[PDB]
């Protein structure tokens, strides 16, 4: 066994010292700490600084060993697969007409911008559905293709509370978290200014959007 990851408790969030390529864990765990509905025996200890049970649980779920890089968005999908804490309604246009798609979930694999986008194909006309957001309610997190340029606040369909941030190669990169609600970027146990770009997720709390 190696020794436990060291921690810091910063403005209500436990954060993990950078070591052994653990940043994907840190990024995911920092987001889970935003959801008061998320819980279990190993998480109750993590919230207090006693982090190795849950951290070990993250390696088990992903089949990865301590020391290997991973994917913070994949890990959020795993841990949140049995939660359903938000509702998103889309309008979907194809050659048959227009219809609504209802998604109830905690993690959504969608881009969180208020523009038009494709999602699925209609099995009666075989065209791709051209889609747009009609509403978002509750709490949850979008996991998404990297937004690598700044995004005007008015473009997000929801008000972001925080974003996983990923810089570098898909091979050789590094995770951090833009904590928008606090005003800084968390990078290991340290603090940096918001990167404002490079975002791989978008977390929202108590959404109540009509568009
Ligand atoms: Zn159709």
């Amino acid at each position: 066994s190696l020794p436990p990851f060291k921690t810091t408790n910063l403005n209500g969030k436990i954060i993990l010292k950078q070591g052994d390529n653990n940043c994907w864990i840190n990024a995911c765990c920092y987001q889970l700490q935003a959801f008061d509905f998320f819980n279990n025996e190993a998480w109750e200890k993590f919230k207090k600084g006693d982090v190795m049970d849950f951290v070990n649980l993250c390696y088990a779920a992903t089949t990865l060993a301590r020391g290997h890089s991973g994917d913070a968005e994949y890990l959020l999908e795993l841990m949140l697969n049995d939660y359903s804490t938000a509702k998103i309604v889309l309008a979907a246009k194809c050659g048959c007409g227009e219809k609504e798609i209802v998604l109830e979930r905690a993690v959504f694999k969608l881009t969180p911008l208020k523009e038009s986008f494709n999602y699925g194909v209609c099995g009666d006309c075989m065209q791709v559905n051209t889609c747009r957001f009609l509403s978002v309610e509750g709490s949850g997190v979008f996991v998404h293709d990297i937004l690598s340029k700044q995004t005007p606040e008015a473009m997000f369909v929801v008000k972001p509370v925080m974003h996983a941030v990923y810089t570098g190669t898909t091979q050789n990169g590094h995770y951090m978290v833009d904590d928008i609600e606090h005003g800084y970027c968390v990078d290991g146990m340290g603090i940096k200014p918001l990167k404002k770009r490079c975002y791989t997720s978008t977390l929202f709390i108590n959404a109540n959007v009509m568009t």
Side-chain angles (χ1 to χ4, degrees):
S1 58
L2 260 62
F5 288 141
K6 285 167 186 325
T7 68
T8 296
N9 183 5
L10 186 63
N11 304 319
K13 290 267 177 301
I14 290 295
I15 65 199
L16 310 169
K17 176 156 188 187
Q18 198 152 322
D20 283 329
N21 292 320
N22 72 5
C23 43
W24 61 287
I25 312 292
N26 192 37
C28 171
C29 290
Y30 196 93
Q31 309 170 81
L32 293 175
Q33 295 179 73
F35 297 135
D36 297 312
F37 59 74
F38 178 78
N39 231 324
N40 64 64
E41 285 154 359
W43 183 245
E44 196 68 24
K45 298 201 194 88
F46 179 94
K47 275 145 84 200
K48 280 194 306 229
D50 184 5
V51 297
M52 302 313 278
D53 283 349
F54 187 82
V55 159
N56 284 326
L57 182 54
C58 291
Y59 290 122
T62 58
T63 278
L64 290 171
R66 176 142 167 182
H68 197 270
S69 274
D71 177 316
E73 284 68 57
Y74 180 63
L75 178 68
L76 276 169
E77 289 158 47
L78 297 177
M79 298 297 145
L80 286 165
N81 192 39
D82 50 336
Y83 289 80
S84 168
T85 45
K87 183 176 176 182
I88 286 172
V89 190
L90 315 180
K93 200 173 277 265
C94 66
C96 307
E98 198 186 72
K99 83 211 157 233
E100 284 182 6
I101 301 159
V102 176
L103 296 147
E104 303 169 322
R105 306 177 64 87
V107 177
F108 300 84
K109 304 182 46 86
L110 286 181
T111 291
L113 311 173
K114 290 145 115 83
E115 71 219 4
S116 191
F117 65 92
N118 286 339
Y119 178 74
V121 294
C122 161
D124 311 315
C125 59
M126 313 185 70
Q127 300 174 26
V128 307
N129 299 307
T130 294
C131 290
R132 77 201 145 83
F133 284 105
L134 291 175
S135 68
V136 179
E137 310 149 60
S139 307
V141 54
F142 296 87
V143 297
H144 53 72
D145 281 349
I146 190 165
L147 297 178
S148 58
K149 280 174 178 160
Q150 308 195 15
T151 296
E153 283 153 32
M155 292 299 295
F156 288 109
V157 60
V158 95
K159 211 208 208 232
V161 168
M162 53 175 86
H163 295 272
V165 163
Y166 187 80
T167 69
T169 301
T170 33
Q171 203 77 41
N172 206 74
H174 173 245
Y175 275 100
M176 291 171 329
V177 177
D178 260 24
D179 181 338
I180 303 295
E181 144 202 72
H182 270 113
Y184 44 80
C185 178
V186 180
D187 179 7
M189 291 180 317
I191 286 166
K192 295 187 149 65
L194 297 175
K195 227 227 176 317
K196 291 187 143 338
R197 41 189 270 272
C198 282
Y199 283 167
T200 56
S201 81
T202 298
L203 185 145
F204 60 91
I205 293 292
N206 259 67
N208 189 5
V209 174
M210 289 309 113
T211 54

